[PDB]
Amino acid sequence: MDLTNKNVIFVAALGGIGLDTSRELVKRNLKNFVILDRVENPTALAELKAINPKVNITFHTYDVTVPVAESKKLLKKIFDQLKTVDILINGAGILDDHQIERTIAINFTGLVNTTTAILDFWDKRKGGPGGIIANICSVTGFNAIHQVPVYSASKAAVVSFTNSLAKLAPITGVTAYSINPGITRTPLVHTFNSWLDVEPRVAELLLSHPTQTSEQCGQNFVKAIEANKNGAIWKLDLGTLEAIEWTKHWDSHI
Amino acid sequence: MDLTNKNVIFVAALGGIGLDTSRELVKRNLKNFVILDRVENPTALAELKAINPKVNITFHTYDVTVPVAESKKLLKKIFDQLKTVDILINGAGILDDHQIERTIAINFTGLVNTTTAILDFWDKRKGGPGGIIANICSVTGFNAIHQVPVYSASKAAVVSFTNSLAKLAPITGVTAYSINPGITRTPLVHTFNSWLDVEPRVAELLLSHPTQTSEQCGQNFVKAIEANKNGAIWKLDLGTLEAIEWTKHWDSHI
Numbered sequence: 001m002d003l004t005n006k007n008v009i010f011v012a013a014l015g016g017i018g019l020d021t022s023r024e025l026v027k028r029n030l031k032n033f034v035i036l037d038r039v040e041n042p043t044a045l046a047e048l049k050a051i052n053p054k055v056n057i058t059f060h061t062y063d064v065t066v067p068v069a070e071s072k073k074l075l076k077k078i079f080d081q082l083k084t085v086d087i088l089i090n091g092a093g094i095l096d097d098h099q100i101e102r103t104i105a106i107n108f109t110g111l112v113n114t115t116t117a118i119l120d121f122w123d124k125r126k127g128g129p130g131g132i133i134a135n136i137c138s139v140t141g142f143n144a145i146h147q148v149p150v151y152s153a154s155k156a157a158v159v160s161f162t163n164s165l166a167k168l169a170p171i172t173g174v175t176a177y178s179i180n181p182g183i184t185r186t187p188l189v190h191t192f193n194s195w196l197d198v199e200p201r202v203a204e205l206l207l208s209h210p211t212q213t214s215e216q217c218g219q220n221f222v223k224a225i226e227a228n229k230n231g232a233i234w235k236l237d238l239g240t241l242e243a244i245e246w247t248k249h250w251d252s253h254i
Numbered sequence: 255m256d257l258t259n260k261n262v263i264f265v266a267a268l269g270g271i272g273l274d275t276s277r278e279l280v281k282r283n284l285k286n287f288v289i290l291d292r293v294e295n296p297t298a299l300a301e302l303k304a305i306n307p308k309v310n311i312t313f314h315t316y317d318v319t320v321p322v323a324e325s326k327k328l329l330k331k332i333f334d335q336l337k338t339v340d341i342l343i344n345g346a347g348i349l350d351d352h353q354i355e356r357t358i359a360i361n362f363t364g365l366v367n368t369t370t371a372i373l374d375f376w377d378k379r380k381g382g383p384g385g386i387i388a389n390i391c392s393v394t395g396f397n398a399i400h401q402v403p404v405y406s407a408s409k410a411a412v413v414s415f416t417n418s419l420a421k422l423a424p425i426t427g428v429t430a431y432s433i434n435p436g437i438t439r440t441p442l443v444h445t446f447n448s449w450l451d452v453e454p455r456v457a458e459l460l461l462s463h464p465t466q467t468s469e470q471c472g473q474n475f476v477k478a479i480e481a482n483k484n485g486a487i488w489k490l491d492l493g494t495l496e497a498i499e500w501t502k503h504w505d506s507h508i
Binding site for chain 1: 322354355358362363366367370373377393394395396397398399400401403404406407408409410411412413414415417418419421422425426436449450452453456459460463489491498500501502503504505506507508
């Protein structure tokens with residue numbers, strides 16, 4: 001998939017691995033790069049524009065926790081200006097098991113709602129042109145870091161949801177795949193809260209094992225996008241890009 | 255594990271497979287059987303007491319969507335009266351992908367919060383005696399019914415959360431395992447809403463393949479409880495009871 005002249009919407013582009021992914025994306029000569037984030041980041045925005053002035057970069061304040069009606073309102077405005085949107089990247093996320101409700105609302109519910117909102121413009125059943133959805137999940141969605149069970153569980157949910165989205169492609173015209181980074185040194189400062197404080201040294205311990213750089217992840221992130229494989233479960237761990245096969249324990253046959 | 259003289263709390267005992275599971279449980283001569291559900295079902299309550307008058311059956315109105323503080327309040331009342339609680343069964347659930355927020359709040363968030371609430375009385379770190387948690391999930395937690403992606407995703411979340419709970423046992427003293435029923439004829443009315451109506455005939459189609467009876471599931475449910483295997487991922491499909499092995503795609507090393 002050629003990203004040249006493509007219109008992309010990136011939710012939470014200015015955070016964590018999102019920034020390094022954004023840096024790589026803008027280098028691909030996109031036509032429009034729409035960033036939707038809850039918090040304004042003038043510095044990051046300035047850097048991106050400086051990387052490739054050719055790309056039209058616009059920022060819109062967006063809280064993934066708002067109702068679907070709210071998201072449809074904002075998306076309508078964007079589709080009105082761009083006419084078309086080729087890819088949507090859902091990258092909102094939080095890691096803090098002391099915030100149970102918020103973790104689920106941001107990592108799981110918000111992703112599902114934003115996806116549900118855009119389907120209103122992309123659903124081929126409604127005469128839409130279809131589209132592509134790239135969901136940023138996590139390797140914890142495969143096998144949890146049991147010390148942060150809520151975060152891990154919310155990610156397992158998105159890995160499943162994304163897998164389902166891909167299977168619905170023939171009906172909606174919307175393809176999808178998940179991007180699952182392993183442990184990376186992207187969160188500016190490492191120190192997250194474990195559920196019921198079962199392990200206050202989780203960050204410290206995790207960093208005691210092989211990790212990957214934020215840049216290594218960003219580059220593989222774009223490579224996965226260009227691969228454009230519907231239903232792919234991409235694992236971005238230790239600087240490599242690999243598609244894992246989901247084990248089949250049960251089938252619905254439909 | 256002998257259920258004789260045991261004190262059990264069952265969230266959503268009067269619904270779906272919960273009723274047939276409750277019928278089998280009461281036959282095991284429990285000391286106290288505490289049912290926590292949204293609305294009382296007099297007929298079901300009357301039937302259970304009639305099955306084994308020896309068991310003290312109590313019902314308390316409970317909405318899993320309430321804050322953890324609220325759950326701690328109710329649980330405190332129960333523990334004060336009973337003194338000890340041996341097992342907690344989280345069986346609240348809803349299947350309706352037209353209700354995105356509610357599905358996640360009931361199937362995922364509520365289970366996590368009730369679990370978080372009881373740990374206040376069971377955490378060995380707080381001098382608690384530990385305990386056992388049986389989470390009713392679903393085979394859709396392994397592999398989704400993509401037509402109801404939100405429901406399936408919420409279940410994948412609980413399968414993950416339960417797996418994490420089990421790994422924390424050495425720290426909390428609380429063991430846990432998941433009960434995952436396959437397609438069963440327990441929901442009185444069969445006709446659920448698919449996400450964005452991708453398939454309005456999901457129920458019809460699902461019932462066109464091999465299923466199991468509500469009673470078959472209930473009996474295997476109790477057998478799983480008696481097996482008392484921490485970290486077990488029980489699959490109750492087609493009348494059988496089997497423990498599946500979760501694939502290790504990634505290792506946190508911690």
